Symmetry: C3
Subunit: 108 residues, 3 copies
């Protein structure tokens, strides 16, 4: 393609790429705030469960819980030590893949 056509399409491309990256970063920030808040809720709730005599008899759900869980998606405690949320990190691989892609287009 002509170089001016390629420059224009490349500019529109860059624009949408930057918008995607912006949304990616903003969503990741808000999700991390939610993760911190939820993990704090879990911490305090576990302390409460460990110190409240009226609920000291209630066990933590065993593995079958995941299908007990499947009523709403498809007793006992669902929140446990292993309920904390990991860090959410969106991938950036496709960006460098684009860079390499149009680099080879500009060298071929």
């Amino acid at each position: 393609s002509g170089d001016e056509e390629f420059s224009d399409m490349l500019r529109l491309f860059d624009f949408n790429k930057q918008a995607i990256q912006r949304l990616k970063a903003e969503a990741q920030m808000s999700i991390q705030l939610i993760n911190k808040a939820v993990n704090a809720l879990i911490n305090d709730q576990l302390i409460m469960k460990n110190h409240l005599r009226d609920i000291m008899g209630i066990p933590y759900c065993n593995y079958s819980k995941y299908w007990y869980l499947n009523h709403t998606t498809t007793k006992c405690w669902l929140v446990s030590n292993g309920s904390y949320l990991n860090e959410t990190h969106f991938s950036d691989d496709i960006e460098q893949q684009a860079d390499n892609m149009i680099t080879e287009m500009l060298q071929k």
Copy 2:
């Protein structure tokens, strides 16, 4: 619609951004569903707690007016906001416009 070699280039750049959008959609939906699982587990256990803890078994659950109490509370209670109907549904992002792209380029190509 334009020259075929030009259109192939713009269509390749288009593919790249479409694939990036799909990737972001899938990753965000995954993390949001994990959060939904965690929040629903919190709701379940908190309701058990509220139903068995004698010091708080007198507190009623908030009725429908809560939502405007809630709106005022966002700017600035005697009852529970989390109830049986506080669980989060599964979040599913839409994909219709993706094949709308297919339809678009299909009409463009002849």
Copy 3:
């Protein structure tokens, strides 16, 4: 760039822009529902902490909690644990409008 070539690349552009906007709105909706749910949990848990006599000896964590994070029993959820409204930005969209505006003013 000939006007018909620019129209084709511009239509493909519009499509991906619209898809980004759709995803932005849906993600913001789901995130806000999560925020409402978490804030309701926080509110009720604070009520609970205020009315459960057996656990009132437990303090709320002081500022050192943030380094507790980098790894002591105290409360992490407090009055200032609520989640703000999530609002994704649109600054770059009108910049696109201006971008193609100057491109079409050279036509």
